[PDB]
Amino acid sequence: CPVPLAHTPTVTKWFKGITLHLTATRPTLLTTRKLGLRADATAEWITGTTS
Amino acid sequence: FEHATTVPNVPGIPYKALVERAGYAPLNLEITVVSSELTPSTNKEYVTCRFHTVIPSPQVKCCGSLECKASSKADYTCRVFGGVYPFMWGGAQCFCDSENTQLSEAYVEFAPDCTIDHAVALKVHTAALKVGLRIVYGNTTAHLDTFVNGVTPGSSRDLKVIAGPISAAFSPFDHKVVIRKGLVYNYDFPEYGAMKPGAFGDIQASSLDATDIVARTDIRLLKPSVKNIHVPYTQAVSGYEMWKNNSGRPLQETAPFGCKIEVEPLRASNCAYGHIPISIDIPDAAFVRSSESPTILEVSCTVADCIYSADFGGSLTLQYKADREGHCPVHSHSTTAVLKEATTHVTAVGSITLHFSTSSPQANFIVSLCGKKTTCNAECKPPADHIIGEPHKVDQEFQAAVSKTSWNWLLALFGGASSLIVVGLIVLVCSSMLINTRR
Amino acid sequence: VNGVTPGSSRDLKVIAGPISAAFSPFDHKVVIRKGLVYNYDFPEYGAMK
Amino acid sequence: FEHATTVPNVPGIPYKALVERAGYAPLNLEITVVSSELTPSTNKEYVTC
């Protein structure tokens, strides 16, 4: 089945931290995890446009 | 001759080593972890899914009671009721009034759709790491897959490669895990036979098609009440669906070390954790005699402006004097720095240049060409770009994280304090002896 | 024997455990042959000697 | 009334207990391990011959 692909998030790079600018007119799942000793995984349903 | 070295368990990183079978010239060796497949040992504890509560049409009797004959059906909990006198579309279905009795029978089976969306519960046991390695040594190269246990020779071609055990053992799966639709969740599912209503594993079986179904669902039946024949009953919400709503986040979004998670079979792929001990009895036909190989009378390291970063942000230039033109191996003998190139066509006399990557702000890494060794030395500046789409190609250590000049300053401060207290000791002893000699 | 599973039979619901010992006869590695079984440190899969 | 008692984990041996409840005469309670089935989970590693 086809699934949509919201406009790729515009990254912003800064000291040991990245900013994701996101834009999705419909609820979209964002998930991030560190590849380190601990995952510190987090999940968030973004909506609209936000950072 | 077998060489051995630790290799960073980082997929796609072309870690390099230099072999030194001194009876022959050095040879460039790259141990590249193409992929990893850490596979846990597991068994299907039971399948589970949204149960379907079959309520077979009730048995009726018009002149006596009915025994609640037990059945092997899952969560079979039938009850007998008097005073039923039920109707049907046409009318009453019994002869008498109170003398009639009814048996309401209900049990559960896997819903037809369960065939697809069934949560295979699995217990997880210490996973054995397997890795697909691409090895290249001189012009010769080979690819292989070795289970990283430290005993099996997952040899390919002539490479007697052996790998493991892992420097640090890690399994992303908890002791208990469950797979759903190819998603996977670490979850303390109830053991076989431990079914509880309204929770995961309320219905379980050895396999979805198996008759060995057991279930706990709080299924209970009320006494028929409406004029029309009926079997009003209640049950906890399907525990599988309840867990579905509150499943949390799957391990594919939560495993550490960047492990990708693949199902069928359950395994962790391209995970990056610890170091892999590697030994390789490379075919000695791959060496070339030191006398037939090029060798360099002299070499010096001049490093250009270099950036410490994950990519090859450093660049250096090597002048050389060589006995004969050819392809010398080149490698870094220092763990803090790694070169991009591994071999270079070299003339009788000229200048080689090499791209390199390092994490240390200093450049005191011993580059080697045809086995000759030269200490590079320079300041590398911090990276201008905070983020790059590639993992750091090297680790770092505090002994090398301190910069040359910062290290000089810190040691000068401690040297000052130590020398001052030394002066104190010296003057105390000297003054004591100066007094007592004439006291 | 986990301490929870109700072995409900007729009107008698019962729970049992945990066992007073974590004993098991089977060693970590076992091999079955013709119905006989032997605890034995066999080499893992992909390990052949 | 959830009576609770330990039982010697011995098959065949009939452990006899007595429940003592305020309003009622004691009730004989004999509990016997007729069978036991200490089964560990296992997975086929490989077959050999």
Side-chain angles (χ1 to χ4, degrees):
Chain A
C1 300
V3 290
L5 287 163
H7 288 325
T8 302
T10 293
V11 302
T12 289
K13 305 174 174 191
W14 49 271
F15 174 65
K16 295 188 189 288
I18 65 100
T19 299
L20 295 184
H21 301 286
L22 309 108
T23 58
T25 195
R26 306 307 303 178
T28 300
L29 175 62
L30 173 62
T31 61
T32 55
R33 60 181 181 148
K34 282 185 279 284
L35 294 83
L37 314 184
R38 76 179 70 83
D40 194 29
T42 183
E44 176 170 18
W45 289 101
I46 295 295
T47 56
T49 63
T50 192
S51 63
Chain B
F1 154 82
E2 89 302 340
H3 177 62
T5 181
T6 46
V7 178
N9 184 27
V10 192
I13 297 306
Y15 172 86
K16 312 199 197 297
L18 183 80
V19 304
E20 195 181 300
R21 207 282 280 266
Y24 290 73
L27 173 149
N28 60 296
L29 174 65
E30 310 188 342
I31 308 299
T32 78
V33 177
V34 176
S35 63
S36 64
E37 287 284 34
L38 175 66
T39 179
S41 299
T42 62
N43 76 300
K44 285 162 58 184
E45 292 281 63
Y46 50 86
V47 298
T48 186
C49 75
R50 172 165 160 261
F51 60 83
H52 178 201
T53 60
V54 69
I55 44 161
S57 171
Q59 185 168 9
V60 311
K61 187 66 172 181
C62 312
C63 281
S65 196
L66 289 167
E67 72 295 332
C68 61
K69 45 181 170 294
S71 177
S72 59
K73 292 306 188 84
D75 213 1
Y76 191 86
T77 54
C78 310
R79 276 186 59 166
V80 57
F81 303 87
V84 59
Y85 187 65
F87 278 64
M88 261 176 69
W89 163 236
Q93 301 301 306
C94 297
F95 301 43
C96 308
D97 302 332
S98 189
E99 303 89 329
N100 323 279
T101 72
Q102 182 261 49
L103 166 62
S104 288
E105 175 168 18
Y107 57 92
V108 310
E109 287 192 352
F110 302 125
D113 292 354
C114 291
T115 53
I116 294 285
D117 59 352
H118 63 79
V120 178
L122 305 98
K123 185 162 283 147
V124 178
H125 277 65
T126 52
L129 176 63
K130 190 181 73 81
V131 296
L133 309 185
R134 156 164 59 83
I135 312 301
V136 52
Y137 56 109
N139 296 81
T140 309
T141 180
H143 321 300
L144 68 96
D145 55 351
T146 286
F147 291 70
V148 192
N149 58 64
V151 186
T152 190
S155 183
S156 184
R157 285 67 173 173
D158 293 339
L159 298 186
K160 315 303 178 179
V161 166
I162 180 160
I166 321 304
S167 77
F170 144 72
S171 57
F173 312 103
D174 288 332
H175 185 197
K176 291 182 175 177
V177 77
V178 59
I179 303 175
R180 162 177 159 78
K181 303 182 70 177
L183 303 181
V184 55
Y185 303 79
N186 59 301
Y187 187 87
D188 57 315
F189 60 76
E191 294 179 350
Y192 185 74
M195 304 74 59
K196 285 172 56 69
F200 182 93
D202 57 348
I203 183 175
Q204 303 182 169
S206 178
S207 280
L208 180 140
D209 56 353
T211 314
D212 186 25
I213 312 180
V214 295
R216 290 249 50 61
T217 63
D218 192 33
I219 276 168
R220 58 180 70 207
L221 302 89
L222 305 184
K223 186 171 182 181
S225 306
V226 50
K227 184 210 205 74
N228 314 60
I229 176 61
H230 195 239
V231 57
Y233 74 118
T234 66
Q235 59 196 245
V237 285
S238 53
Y240 174 70
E241 195 274 339
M242 171 50 58
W243 170 78
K244 194 199 297 180
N245 194 84
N246 302 355
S247 69
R249 301 314 311 163
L251 186 65
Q252 285 159 329
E253 301 169 357
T254 314
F257 295 106
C259 294
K260 167 182 176 209
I261 322 292
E262 301 183 18
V263 298
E264 304 167 352
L266 177 62
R267 62 198 186 272
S269 73
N270 296 352
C271 207
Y273 65 99
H275 296 279
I276 312 305
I278 294 289
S279 307
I280 186 170
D281 188 16
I282 53 180
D284 74 335
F287 301 141
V288 286
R289 280 293 190 178
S290 320
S291 187
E292 83 190 324
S293 173
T295 196
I296 69 192
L297 295 68
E298 168 64 323
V299 49
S300 66
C301 176
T302 295
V303 51
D305 192 350
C306 57
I307 284 173
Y308 57 91
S309 61
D311 66 333
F312 303 109
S315 179
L316 75 159
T317 53
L318 267 57
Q319 276 67 41
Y320 61 83
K321 293 293 196 72
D323 63 349
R324 210 177 76 262
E325 60 83 23
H327 305 287
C328 280
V330 63
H331 188 251
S332 171
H333 294 180
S334 304
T335 189
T336 62
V338 175
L339 312 182
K340 182 176 183 183
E341 303 286 46
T343 64
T344 53
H345 178 60
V346 69
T347 79
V349 177
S351 303
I352 287 303
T353 187
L354 304 164
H355 315 86
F356 80 96
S357 56
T358 180
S359 58
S360 44
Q362 67 190 358
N364 293 63
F365 50 85
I366 297 86
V367 180
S368 178
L369 197 151
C370 264
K372 283 285 274 280
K373 291 152 65 92
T374 58
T375 295
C376 296
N377 190 340
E379 291 84 44
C380 291
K381 287 178 291 181
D385 193 4
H386 299 280
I387 300 290
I388 195 65
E390 184 178 339
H392 275 275
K393 211 166 298 295
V394 73
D395 203 354
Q396 75 283 357
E397 175 61 303
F398 83 88
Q399 178 62 96
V402 294
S403 86
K404 165 176 165 277
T405 189
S406 65
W407 193 233
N408 289 0
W409 270 101
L410 179 55
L411 295 185
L413 266 296
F414 276 65
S418 55
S419 60
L420 285 167
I421 186 166
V422 161
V423 164
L425 167 64
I426 290 163
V427 75
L428 282 169
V429 174
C430 293
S431 58
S432 179
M433 294 301 101
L434 283 167
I435 301 153
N436 285 280
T437 298
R438 302 183 179 94
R439 203 268 302 126
Chain C
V1 191
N2 66 347
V4 181
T5 71
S8 306
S9 180
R10 260 301 306 242
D11 312 358
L12 271 193
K13 92 91 181 179
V14 186
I15 65 175
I19 294 295
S20 192
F23 164 76
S24 298
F26 311 102
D27 203 350
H28 186 209
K29 293 180 175 179
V30 309
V31 51
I32 298 172
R33 167 188 166 67
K34 305 177 67 178
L36 301 180
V37 69
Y38 310 76
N39 51 300
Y40 178 83
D41 290 321
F42 56 70
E44 295 77 11
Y45 184 51
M48 293 76 61
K49 182 183 297 290
Chain D
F1 175 84
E2 276 189 353
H3 169 62
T5 182
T6 54
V7 173
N9 177 49
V10 187
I13 283 299
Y15 176 66
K16 294 173 193 279
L18 189 77
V19 305
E20 185 174 32
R21 185 182 178 175
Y24 310 95
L27 169 68
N28 64 300
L29 175 65
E30 168 179 309
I31 174 161
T32 82
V33 174
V34 177
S35 65
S36 71
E37 184 170 356
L38 182 68
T39 177
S41 299
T42 56
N43 72 286
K44 182 192 305 292
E45 284 284 87
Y46 50 84
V47 300
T48 188
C49 63

Coordinates of all heavy atoms in Angstrom, one line a residue, chain B residues 68 125-126 128 147 149 151-153 191-196 216, chain C residues 1-2 4-8 10 28 43-49:
Chain B
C68 N -23.6 -29.7 32.9 CA -22.6 -28.8 32.4 C -21.3 -29.6 32.0 O -20.2 -29.3 32.4 CB -22.2 -27.8 33.4 SG -21.6 -28.4 35.0
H125 N 17.1 -15.5 24.7 CA 18.3 -16.0 25.3 C 19.6 -15.4 24.6 O 19.5 -15.1 23.4 CB 18.4 -17.5 25.4 CG 17.6 -18.0 26.5 ND1 16.2 -17.8 26.7 CD2 18.0 -18.6 27.7 CE1 15.9 -18.3 27.8 NE2 16.9 -18.8 28.5
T126 N 20.7 -15.3 25.3 CA 21.9 -14.6 24.9 C 22.2 -14.8 23.4 O 22.5 -15.9 22.9 CB 23.1 -15.1 25.7 OG1 23.1 -16.5 25.7 CG2 22.9 -14.6 27.2
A128 N 23.9 -14.7 19.8 CA 25.2 -14.9 19.3 C 25.4 -13.9 18.1 O 24.5 -14.0 17.2 CB 25.4 -16.3 18.8
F147 N 30.2 -16.1 12.3 CA 29.5 -16.0 13.6 C 30.6 -15.6 14.6 O 31.6 -16.3 14.8 CB 28.9 -17.3 14.0 CG 27.8 -17.7 13.1 CD1 28.0 -18.1 11.8 CD2 26.5 -17.7 13.6 CE1 26.9 -18.5 11.0 CE2 25.4 -18.1 12.8 CZ 25.6 -18.5 11.5
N149 N 31.7 -15.8 17.7 CA 31.8 -16.4 19.0 C 33.2 -16.6 19.5 O 33.3 -16.9 20.7 CB 31.1 -17.8 18.9 CG 31.7 -18.7 17.9 OD1 32.8 -19.1 18.0 ND2 30.9 -19.1 16.9
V151 N 35.3 -19.0 18.2 CA 35.7 -20.4 18.1 C 35.5 -20.9 16.7 O 36.4 -21.6 16.1 CB 34.9 -21.3 19.1 CG1 35.4 -22.7 19.0 CG2 35.0 -20.8 20.5
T152 N 34.4 -20.5 16.0 CA 34.2 -21.0 14.7 C 35.0 -20.3 13.7 O 35.2 -19.0 13.7 CB 32.7 -20.8 14.3 OG1 32.4 -21.5 13.1 CG2 32.3 -19.4 14.1
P153 N 35.7 -21.0 12.8 CA 36.4 -20.4 11.6 C 35.4 -20.2 10.5 O 35.3 -21.1 9.6 CB 37.5 -21.4 11.3 CG 36.9 -22.7 11.7 CD 36.0 -22.4 12.8
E191 N 3.6 -16.0 31.2 CA 4.1 -17.2 30.7 C 2.9 -18.1 30.2 O 1.8 -17.8 30.4 CB 4.8 -18.0 31.8 CG 6.1 -17.3 32.2 CD 6.8 -18.0 33.4 OE1 6.2 -18.9 33.9 OE2 8.0 -17.6 33.7
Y192 N 3.3 -19.2 29.6 CA 2.3 -20.2 29.1 C 1.4 -20.6 30.3 O 1.9 -20.9 31.3 CB 3.0 -21.4 28.5 CG 2.0 -22.3 27.9 CD1 1.3 -22.1 26.7 CD2 1.7 -23.5 28.5 CE1 0.4 -22.9 26.2 CE2 0.8 -24.4 28.0 CZ 0.1 -24.1 26.8 OH -0.8 -25.0 26.2
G193 N 0.1 -20.6 30.0 CA -0.8 -20.9 31.1 C -1.1 -19.8 32.1 O -2.0 -20.0 32.9
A194 N -0.4 -18.7 32.0 CA -0.6 -17.6 32.9 C -1.7 -16.6 32.5 O -1.6 -15.4 32.9 CB 0.7 -16.9 33.2
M195 N -2.6 -17.0 31.6 CA -3.5 -16.1 31.1 C -4.3 -15.3 32.2 O -4.7 -15.9 33.2 CB -4.5 -16.8 30.2 CG -3.9 -17.6 29.0 SD -3.1 -19.1 29.6 CE -4.5 -19.9 30.3
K196 N -4.5 -14.0 32.0 CA -5.2 -13.2 32.9 C -6.2 -12.3 32.0 O -5.8 -11.9 30.9 CB -4.3 -12.2 33.7 CG -3.6 -12.9 34.8 CD -2.5 -12.0 35.4 CE -3.2 -10.7 35.9 NZ -4.1 -10.9 37.0
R216 N -8.1 -17.3 29.5 CA -8.7 -16.7 30.7 C -9.2 -15.4 30.3 O -8.4 -14.5 29.8 CB -7.6 -16.6 31.8 CG -7.1 -17.8 32.5 CD -7.6 -18.0 33.9 NE -9.0 -17.8 34.1 CZ -10.0 -18.5 33.5 NH1 -9.7 -19.5 32.7 NH2 -11.3 -18.3 33.8
Chain C
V1 N 3.6 -23.6 38.1 CA 4.1 -23.1 39.4 C 4.8 -21.8 39.2 O 6.1 -21.7 39.2 CB 5.1 -24.1 40.0 CG1 5.4 -23.8 41.4 CG2 4.4 -25.5 39.9
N2 N 4.0 -20.7 39.1 CA 4.6 -19.3 39.0 C 4.1 -18.5 40.1 O 4.7 -17.5 40.4 CB 4.2 -18.7 37.7 CG 2.7 -18.4 37.6 OD1 1.9 -18.9 38.3 ND2 2.3 -17.5 36.6
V4 N 0.7 -17.5 40.2 CA -0.4 -16.8 39.7 C -1.4 -17.7 39.0 O -2.6 -17.5 39.2 CB 0.0 -15.6 38.8 CG1 -1.2 -14.8 38.3 CG2 1.0 -14.7 39.5
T5 N -1.0 -18.5 38.1 CA -1.8 -19.3 37.2 C -2.9 -20.0 38.0 O -2.6 -20.9 38.8 CB -1.0 -20.3 36.4 OG1 -0.6 -21.3 37.2 CG2 0.1 -19.6 35.7
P6 N -4.2 -19.7 37.8 CA -5.2 -20.4 38.5 C -5.5 -21.7 37.8 O -6.1 -21.8 36.7 CB -6.4 -19.4 38.4 CG -6.2 -18.7 37.2 CD -4.7 -18.6 37.0
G7 N -5.1 -22.8 38.5 CA -5.4 -24.1 37.9 C -6.9 -24.5 38.2 O -7.1 -25.7 38.6
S8 N -7.8 -23.6 38.0 CA -9.2 -23.8 38.3 C -9.7 -25.1 37.7 O -9.7 -25.3 36.5 CB -10.0 -22.6 37.8 OG -9.5 -21.4 38.3
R10 N -13.3 -27.4 38.3 CA -14.6 -27.4 38.9 C -14.8 -26.2 39.9 O -14.7 -25.1 39.4 CB -14.9 -28.8 39.6 CG -15.7 -29.7 38.8 CD -17.1 -29.1 38.5 NE -17.7 -28.7 39.7 CZ -18.9 -29.2 40.2 NH1 -19.5 -30.2 39.5 NH2 -19.4 -28.8 41.3
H28 N 22.6 -26.1 30.8 CA 22.3 -25.1 29.8 C 22.3 -25.7 28.3 O 21.5 -25.3 27.5 CB 23.3 -24.0 29.8 CG 23.0 -22.8 28.9 ND1 24.0 -22.0 28.4 CD2 21.8 -22.4 28.5 CE1 23.4 -21.1 27.7 NE2 22.1 -21.3 27.7
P43 N 29.0 -27.5 20.4 CA 29.3 -26.3 19.8 C 28.0 -25.6 19.2 O 27.2 -26.3 18.7 CB 30.3 -26.6 18.7 CG 29.9 -28.0 18.3 CD 29.4 -28.7 19.6
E44 N 28.0 -24.3 19.3 CA 26.8 -23.6 18.8 C 26.7 -23.7 17.3 O 27.6 -24.1 16.6 CB 26.9 -22.1 19.2 CG 26.9 -21.8 20.7 CD 28.2 -22.2 21.4 OE1 29.2 -22.4 20.6 OE2 28.2 -22.2 22.6
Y45 N 25.5 -23.3 16.8 CA 25.3 -23.3 15.4 C 26.3 -22.5 14.7 O 26.7 -21.4 15.1 CB 23.9 -22.8 15.1 CG 23.5 -22.9 13.6 CD1 23.7 -24.1 12.9 CD2 23.0 -21.9 12.9 CE1 23.5 -24.2 11.6 CE2 22.7 -22.0 11.6 CZ 22.9 -23.1 10.9 OH 22.6 -23.2 9.6
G46 N 26.7 -22.9 13.5 CA 27.8 -22.3 12.8 C 29.2 -22.6 13.3 O 30.1 -22.3 12.6
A47 N 29.3 -23.2 14.5 CA 30.5 -23.7 15.0 C 30.6 -25.2 14.7 O 29.8 -26.0 15.1 CB 30.6 -23.5 16.5
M48 N 31.6 -25.6 13.9 CA 31.8 -27.0 13.5 C 33.3 -27.3 13.7 O 34.1 -26.5 13.2 CB 31.3 -27.3 12.1 CG 29.8 -27.2 11.9 SD 29.2 -25.5 11.8 CE 30.1 -24.9 10.3
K49 N 33.5 -28.4 14.3 CA 34.9 -28.8 14.6 C 35.1 -30.3 14.2 O 34.2 -31.1 14.4 CB 35.2 -28.7 16.1 CG 36.6 -29.0 16.5 CD 36.7 -28.9 18.0 CE 36.5 -27.5 18.5 NZ 37.6 -26.6 18.0

